[PDB]
Design a protein around this nucleic acid. Structure first.
Ligand code: MG
Ligand code: MG
Ligand code: MG
Ligand code: MG
Ligand code: ZN
Ligand code: ZN
Lengths: 343, 548, 549, 342
DNA sequence: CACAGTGGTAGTAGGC
DNA sequence: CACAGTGGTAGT
DNA sequence: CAGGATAGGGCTAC
DNA sequence: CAGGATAGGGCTAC
DNA sequence: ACTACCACTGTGCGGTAGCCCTATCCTG
DNA sequence: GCCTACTACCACTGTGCGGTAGCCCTATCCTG
């Protein structure tokens, strides 16, 4: 809705597609920097401080017991609750996929210079696989919080992976991994509703259900207008997860999801297909067992954006959307950036 | 008549003749003589197949993990299935590469005759199938100023990355000793640095670089753990492979070996020493670092299994904050060592002109004035003009005793004159060692005295030039002084293992992109790679040395 | 069954083969075939002697004033005795030139075959010694980025100046008709722009430029006053010379024609009009500026006989504050016209993306954002990469209705769409004229309607681009709109008379400096000049065209 | 004596070797600018303003009655008494040599906008051939006055000028043209003492006489250490001229001559050889009929200077010397400049 | 101690 | 309407 | 008002 | 304190 | 074996990142 | 005696590496 071109001159080159913002008590934090962490910010996590619509990436630091995680681009970022961000998968700047989980909590807040605890979490049980473009989102069944990890892109399995098609990605087997974090375990669930691998799909967990929206399936190269609803029921014993392919789903990929109000998210941006990006921001108003994908007032998209073949971003967290578009000339102006404040 | 298509192709590529200009010449000759002396372009293009990868049948025992056994694979998209989907990372790069398997195979089969000649010259049966250890000089360099073309395709940078490989030393195990059936006589020749991947990317763009090269690194690791059965000279010969990644400049080494930039307090890609420690010790550093150690150290940095601050953690890993992407050898880029050491001598001259040994502080523009003095004089006496960024020829006309004489003409203190003359005398008693392709056979006692001359260089640096080397030292001085003897006793040479060859290959990449390639993004890299592979064909080079 | 030295030289040259590469090829063919198919380098040089100036005996029956009658001089020093004494003006320049008379003789005797062929095609006896009027396009250009070389020699700038000449048309006066026995079909070809002086100076360095060229200009002025008896085909033919200095970029024209820089109130190297008057009238301007008029006007400036203030004096001499030292033709560099006009259309596209017809008060950064929008789009649609400085190729890809159709996708006003599409339709109905080598043949209907199309273009700049063109106008718009019809009535063509040849020859200058010349300040210009002369030798281009004939 | 490295701004490119400074106003004016006068300064003349070792070339202007003379390199510059400046010859930026004389007077001083009546004095009689490196200098004999134009390079005569040696210069026949600016009449005089054509010589004009001093003979390529004294007498008849080669001369060329104090000059710089420029200054003390070329203390020439093959300059007029040296040549700064005061 | 040129002499090998 | 390529590929 | 960012320059590599 | 420099940006060519 | 086609080239044309350390600056 | 062919020699190249100049008009900024 409220579009405003952001300015950043220093550390701009670090904002690459696949970056993942994390809202920690209003303080927005960049992650997924371009390249490996430089000694300016050896962590790769930055304060995403937009003042007067000028963006400053302030080098953040980590805890001592922290795991200095790699800059993961296109990982699965959720908020477990503490308010620690789960980060699964992602492309290590070596174009390696991370099987690791990274629970980035905030350990200490001083100067508004926040120290992080990027605790590595290993996944006992059914480790999903090294993947990216996937979704992780915590459901809350019976007071038990459990990450729901739905597939994204992964490199071909090392058995089928060839160097002539090394970086060839396949949408992971569409499975719903129940990542337990108090148990560090993951449990895959082959849902018959999810048989077309997805990636770069916006995912919305409200209480116990994860609305998987849009996405892209390489097995089809289409962005299916699907709205899978993965309802998770966690009894004390073996869990349960049931998907229901609801209608009204939108065909969008790489979309950004920001919660404007409680149970009212905005799926802005993304892609309807390759050379046609979703320039129509959508509203997703949720309920206990319902979901409505409206079509918000298409923002005053700048010509730079309307004509930007590629466009990426992440949910700053409050109601805002950081949104970058390649504006390169070939050069610390590769990506012209914008903030879309919704409500 | 009398000119086979392979010979015509050798004439074409080695003479840098474009297919268009070669066709002009061929049709002109066919019209003037009537005879078809030169073979037509199609015959050349068919001869290329024999020389390009994807022609000779080979196998790997064990078969290469994650590598297509298909021997029909020549030039492939370096993207390597990398999705250019808008949803994915915006790969903006034209990458074309030979499959490392096929590239090694074509490079060997191209040296088939050379290998047989050398195993005959080594008093061996040239029908030996015994395992040949093929020591390969992996070489990668970013180029820059690679003007991108209008037209279809990505918005590639005006930069290139050329992963090459020079087959440096084929040695077969004839019982006990590793008899050397072939040694690249000119290892830093552009005629020998076989191109393997030309990507229109930036080596500083680690994401793209890695997406393009990790196929090559995967092939390289597979080949390390395998043995290439290859039908050479009618006999199936087995080639073990030793990939020595050395033609990477220190910037690129650090990028790919997970290290901090060259400006990092952690100063070497070989030792875990701080720039300060390196300015204090300056000569006594083992070669600590390695791709395996750097991998363990990135794993430490990431997992932080000791729950350390970023500073003490960095110290624990000694600058390895990034994951080593390439298994480079902890060596020295003799080329860029000359460059950097000569740039440091150039600044040293600037300072001596400024008497900074007497005037620690000095105006920035007064330093520019010293630099201009040095420039005007080097132009007057050494005749070598001022250059924006130091190049090797400048570093050679400058790392000269007559150059230091000329500079001394700009210094009133004859004590500084002798300090500089001694510094250069030592640097030139040392430079043969890390520039010689075989210092044991080109500068043996300059090497035996290398530890001593380096100790003396360090003494002169921390005593007579301590205004420049107190708590700081150039990384290439540290390498020159501390690690060169170790690298000699390990690799046998340093100059042989330099990026010099792949940089000359950058020259030829420019030449081929401008004059021997389809000027379309879709095909520039494919054609440049094809032609730069043929240029490096020891077979075509043989044909071009037929006068001998 | 070997080749002749001259044809092997043609191969070496036109195939850009260096003498080192050629020797590799020759020794390889000699050792492989066992027989000497290619002639060795020494034979090629002995052949070059024939094609290079200083071989063919010639005589100007009016002996050239201040030019040596010696017909043996070839690659002389361009300094031309310029005193490199330390007391003198520092000659920070390496210049190697052919003597313009020797060079013209070698160019003619090089196209001797073509001259006779065209006399025969015209059913004219190929023994006619009639006075051939040789219309030559003397073309000078500056080229920077000329990497200076280490080594002994003056501290030359990283900038060169190629004075070239293109024999454009040889017309013999057969009594009642000025039949053209030769006409350069590809006049802007690099195979025809014959190098005459390779100076390693800046064209902005008027002092050095003049020290180096005024000998060429004196030879030119002498040859303007003499007939060249030259024995070709066994007959002593006589050639009159009409030199036409059109291959000059307007910057260089103004430099050498005594005019203020391109930026100026005085806008044309052709008419004595002001940028304002040129943005108001925009078509009806007569070509007034001649070298003779510019000389008289510099003499007025220097002399200021009417005791006029600098302003009224400068408006009397109309910007001629400097003295002309080259007699360029009042003409249009079709190359740099297309480039400047495409740069102005690029700016127009920027401003239409910015709707400067509505918001004429942008701030330096939305202007940059419009430039970036245009960059991204032309890269997306027209596949045009964003280049720092408009080149001719970007220009001829940008001056297409395709490019306007693309750019209009960035303008939210179909009215401006119509304006831009009309502007480009007119510009493309006009460009064939001042780009064709013979518009009366390549685009006669565009030349007929050029006055009308240019009037329409000018009123479209005055109406729908009142911005960017109220009281201001690019010099090359003024030339395109006002003078082209007159330059065609006068010279029959404009693109034929462009610097495109000498510029394209800058590419060969670079190529030969890198790959066909001794890499020494003392020899680079000599060798490049030699090889770029051989490249432009039609004698050798014939051997390279024997596949056809 | 006081070598002060000078910074120039926005116009450093115009200061070229062969430039001439003229001291009217007590404020010095720069005339010979590189290339032709750009519309920034259509006149070529500039307000040479050294302020705190910074040089600000402020575009001057000419009067209406003025002649917008070309930027003349290595002309013959003298002050003449009004306080005009004679400028004979010089290399027009088209590398042509001026035959005209240009008399730069001064009028209409606006405290910022000094204007010059750069009249064009044309010569009738034994007009000196177009030349440069010569030395015009005003003598005052019997209350009358004349300009002693001597020497100078000139292009070979058009009767003998060939385009292969078009820019080849011959030291003009050694002749002392008495130039009557009173009427613009040049009277040449053959003096046997002047056997060799001199150029780039210093010329020190005391009353009635001109001390030619340390030029460069091109026929010999040598810088003779001669001290020819052209004693000019104007007894209202045929103006008599007697040259006298004096012992004490110095082998210099392209040297700058300042008049520090009256009857006393400083010869700074120049060249002793193409191999070696002259680092020693020379005090030239003048008596009404004598000359003593002492040797001042060699200023503390900056290594920038000591190691610059080429070096040029001009007498600002306050006993100081504006001398330039080739700088770091792509477009860093063409020359470095210094105001060596004495 | 990069190396493959870069071309034009200079000089040196052969043929007569 | 610059033009001479730029190399492969299809098509005579 | 000493501590925690920022800018900028020196320095390392390209 | 309105007039005369200066800086800087727009604009023209390269 | 040629030759066109292809969509483009160059000629137009004159230092960078990163590290780090220190000097600013900017606080609550 | 020549004439032709080969080759060294020279002293350097490039690959190492990422908008100018002018005019001129206006906004700044002196300026006593
Ligand atoms: Mg590089
Ligand atoms: Mg590099
Ligand atoms: Mg020009
Ligand atoms: Mg140019
Ligand atoms: Zn080390
Ligand atoms: Zn005009």
């Amino acid at each position: 809705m409220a579009l405003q071109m952001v300015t950043v001159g220093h550390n701009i080159a670090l904002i690459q597609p696949g970056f993942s913002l994390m809202n920690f008590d209003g303080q927005v934090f960049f992650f997924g920097q371009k390249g490996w962490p430089k000694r300016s910010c050896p962590t790769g996590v930055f304060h995403f401080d937009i003042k007067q619509n000028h963006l400053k990436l302030k080098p953040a630091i980590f805890s001592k017991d922290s795991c200095y995680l790699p800059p993961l681009r296109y990982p699965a970022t959720c908020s477990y609750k503490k308010h620690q961000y789960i980060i699964h998968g992602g492309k290590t700047p070596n174009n390696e996929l991370s099987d690791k989980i990274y629970i980035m909590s905030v350990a200490c807040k001083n100067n508004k210079k926040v120290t992080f605890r990027c605790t590595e979490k290993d996944l006992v049980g059914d480790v999903p696989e090294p993947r990216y473009g996937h979704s992780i989102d915590v459901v809350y069944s019976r007071g038990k919080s459990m990450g729901v990890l739905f597939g994204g892109r992964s490199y071909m399995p090392s058995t089928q992976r060839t160097t002539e098609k090394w970086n060839s990605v396949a949408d992971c087997l569409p499975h719903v991994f129940l990542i337990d974090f108090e148990f560090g375990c993951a449990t895959s669930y082959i849902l018959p509703e999810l048989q077309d691998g997805l990636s770069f799909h916006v995912s919305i967990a409200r209480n116990d259900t994860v609305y998987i929206l849009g996405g892209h399936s390489l097995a089809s190269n289409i962005r299916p207008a699907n709205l899978y609803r993965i309802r998770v029921d966690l009894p004390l014993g073996t869990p349960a997860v049931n998907c229901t392919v609801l209608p009204g789903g939108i065909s969008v990929s790489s979309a950004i999801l920001t919660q404007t109000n409680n149970d009212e998210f905005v799926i802005v941006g993304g892609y309807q297909l390759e050379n046609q990006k979703r320039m129509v921001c959508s509203l997703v108003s949720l309920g206990d067992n319902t979901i409505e994908i409206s079509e918000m007032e298409t923002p005053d998209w700048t010509s730079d954006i309307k004509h930007s073949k590629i466009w990426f971003g992440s949910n700053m967290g409050n109601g805002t959307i950081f949104l970058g578009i390649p504006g390169d000339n070939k050069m610390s102006e590769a990506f012209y950036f914008y903030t879309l404040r919704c409500s | 008549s009398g000119l086979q298509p392979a010979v015509c192709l050798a004439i074409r590529v080695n003479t840098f003749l474009s297919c268009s200009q070669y066709h002009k010449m061929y049709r002109t000759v066919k019209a003037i003589t009537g005879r078809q002396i030169f073979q037509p372009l199609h015959a050349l293009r068919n001869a290329e197949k024999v020389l390009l990868p994807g022609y000779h049948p080979f196998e790997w025992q064990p078969p290469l993990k994650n590598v297509s056994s298909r021997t029909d694979v020549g030039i492939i998209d370096g993207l390597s299935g990398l999705a250019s989907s808008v949803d994915e990372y915006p790969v903006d790069t034209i990458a074309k590469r030979f499959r490392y398997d096929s590239a090694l195979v074509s490079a060997l089969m191209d040296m088939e005759e050379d290998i047989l000649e050398g195993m005959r010259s080594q008093d061996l049966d040239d029908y030996l199938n015994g395992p040949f250890t093929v020591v390969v000089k992996e070489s990668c360099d970013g180029m820059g100023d690679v003007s991108e073309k209008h037209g279809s395709g990505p918005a590639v940078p005006e930069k290139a990355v050329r992963f090459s490989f020079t087959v440096m030393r084929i040695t077969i195990e004839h019982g006990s000793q590793n008899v050397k059936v072939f040694e690249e006589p000119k290892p830093n020749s552009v005629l020998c640095c076989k191109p393997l991947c030309l990507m229109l990317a930036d080596e500083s763009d680690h994401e793209t670089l890695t997406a393009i090269l990790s196929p090559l690194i995967a092939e390289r690791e597979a080949m390390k753990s395998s043995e290439l059965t290859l039908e050479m000279g009618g006999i199936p010969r087995t080639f073990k492979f030793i990939f020595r990644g050395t033609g990477y400049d220190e910037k690129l080494v650090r990028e790919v070996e997970g290290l901090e930039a060259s400006g990092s307090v952690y100063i070497c890609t070989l030792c875990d020493t701080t720039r300060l420690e390196a300015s204090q010790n300056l000569v006594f550093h083992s070669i600590t670092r390695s791709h395996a150690e750097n991998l363990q150290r990135y794993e430490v940095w990431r997992s932080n299994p000791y729950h350390e601050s970023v500073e003490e953690l960095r110290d624990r890993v000694k600058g390895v904050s990034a994951k080593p992407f390439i298994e480079t050898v902890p060596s020295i880029d003799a080329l860029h060592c000359d460059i950097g050491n000569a740039a440091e001598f150039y600044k040293i001259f600037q300072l001596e002109i400024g008497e900074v040994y007497k005037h620690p502080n000095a105006s920035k523009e007064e330093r520019k004035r010293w630099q201009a003095t040095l420039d005007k004089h080097l132009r007057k006496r050494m005749n070598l003009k001022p250059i924006m960024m130091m190049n090797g020829n400048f570093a050679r006309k400058l790392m000269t005793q007559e150059t230091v004489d000329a500079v001394c003409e700009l210094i009133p203190s004859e004590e500084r004159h002798e300090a500089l003359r001694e510094l250069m005398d030592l640097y030139l008693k040392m430079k043969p060692v890390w520039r010689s392709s075989c210092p044991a056979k080109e500068c043996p006692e300059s090497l035996c005295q290398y530890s001593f001359n380096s100790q003396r260089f360090a003494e002169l640096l921390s005593t007579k030039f301590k205004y420049r080397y107190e708590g700081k030292i150039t990384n290439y001085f540290h390498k020159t002084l501390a690690h060169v003897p170790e690298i000699i006793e390990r690799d046998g040479s340093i100059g042989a293992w330099a990026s010099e060859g792949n940089e000359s290959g950058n020259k030829l990449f420019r030449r081929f992109r401008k004059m021997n390639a389809r000027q379309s993004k879709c095909y520039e890299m494919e054609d440049v790679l094809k032609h730069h592979w043929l240029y490096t064909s020891k077979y075509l080079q043989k044909f071009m040395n037929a006068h001998n």
